[PDB]
Amino acid sequence: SLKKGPFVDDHLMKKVEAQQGAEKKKVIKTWSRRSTIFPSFVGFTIAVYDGRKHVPVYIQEDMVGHKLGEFAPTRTYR
Amino acid sequence: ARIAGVDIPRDKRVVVSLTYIYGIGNTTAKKVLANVGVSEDVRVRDLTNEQTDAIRAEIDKLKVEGDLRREVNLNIKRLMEIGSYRGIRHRRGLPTRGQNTKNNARTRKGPT
Amino acid sequence: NRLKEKYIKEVTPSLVEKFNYSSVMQTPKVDKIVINMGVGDAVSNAKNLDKAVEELALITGQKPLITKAKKSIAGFRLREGMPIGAKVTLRGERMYEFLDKLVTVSLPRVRDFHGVSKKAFDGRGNYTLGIKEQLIFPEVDYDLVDKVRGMDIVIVTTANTDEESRELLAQLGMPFQ
Amino acid sequence: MKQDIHPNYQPVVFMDSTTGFKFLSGSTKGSSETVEWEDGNTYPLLRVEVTSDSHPFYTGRQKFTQADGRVDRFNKKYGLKDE
């Protein structure tokens, strides 16, 4: 619903491109609640904040569509 | 068996009966018939052997089959096996927006 | 029939090649076909064979037999003498007519098709072809057939291993996967 | 073959929207339409819609539908937008 291009915050892009040369550092802490996923992210490992703790999760291929917030659910039911 | 994949009834009206097949709504039937150039005919359908082939051809230009389910199935499969909150609540049924579930089971499971 | 023609004109030399039999007699043939329609409900309702045997008479060309009970089981509620199943054996040209039907009209009327399972070897080559429904064959109509029974085709050959039988049936239809 | 205990059967011609595979038999009959030499003087009432070629399996699997392009979704829909 943003047909003028997708969106990811700059204080994550610059911090994800900065590894494009060498290997990737296992940690990218973030807020992780406003960013969709771009093709330049495959193979990384981004930890995801849920308002309480950051959740470390890698990046696969098909896991490229949605936003970052769909992996650290802030519900915790059971 | 019967005329398109399967599932065509007898002694009905045409355009309605063409919706019956899995994947054909209402616009599909009207546009298909448009590309042949036909009408109701009439309330007990009395099609000709040529019109049947015409519609059998124009239908085979649509992803709608007795196989549309396989695509949907694999899509929700890709969903439920990566993250996935949508897939997780798709092991328990919640939508693209959520509705504050303290009645939203009376359509999915018959909670009572 | 056309199969017997195609058989004796193509299958025999090809198979004689692929294994080099000392004599053409050594050929792996097709012998018979039996069909198995197990009602499994006469003990409950004996008013089901009354139509099973009919649908059979329509599929094959002859009225089936009627298999007995042969024993007694309580969980099933089986008493001896009760009928459960009805069968037919196919020989002669009708074998080939019906197998032509199978390979050419019958099988490709089944939704979501990949072919026949590649594994019915038995280590001696008598492949079966289970079927779920019975609405497949055009000898069957919509508003006349009111159940979803099935059969168990038991084709037999004269082959000893399973690869011979496989690549034989390949020559005679059998759209595998 | 015994008597009076076996139903009807005739070498009915099979057919389709193509291929005129008119050789087999059956047990459903009716309005006579093909009394011909090259086949049995019989009926094409069997107008099955499967040539054993409709399902592209005996004619081999085709590209009837694709159902292939999930990767370009991200890589073309906003991938045309990429480059």
Added chain:
RNA sequence: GACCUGGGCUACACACGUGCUACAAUGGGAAGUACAACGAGUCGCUAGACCGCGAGGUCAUGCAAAUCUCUUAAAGCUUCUCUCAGUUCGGAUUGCAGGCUGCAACUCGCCUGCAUGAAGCCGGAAUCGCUAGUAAUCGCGGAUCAGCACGCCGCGGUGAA
């Protein structure tokens, strides 16, 4: 006591109160055809025309007002089709592709198109409202408010026992 980001207040085996849409032939659909009233409007109401089936977009037009716009109201009236079926009724739910505002719509917006098509054929004991332009039924507007109403506050149309 205080500053900021992220999440809550939207959590779901369950019990209850209030409401809306329904279980169709006085109806479903398609096509023509007329009639109100109360109020809102400068960074806002959009005229007109063009484009896409749609939500809409583009350029442009008046209006700080009995002038211009929201806005030809909807049930109504006239023909045709559908035949008593879970039905062409019902459209919950869900896949995909879009639109708008928004720095940003997974958590947690409104709306559109296609596709799929759930329970549901007048509801126990019990219990509520209502004496007339009322009950019943159908539309209009605005308060808060980028945006989001089946709620609330007013208006009018048809019109009983």
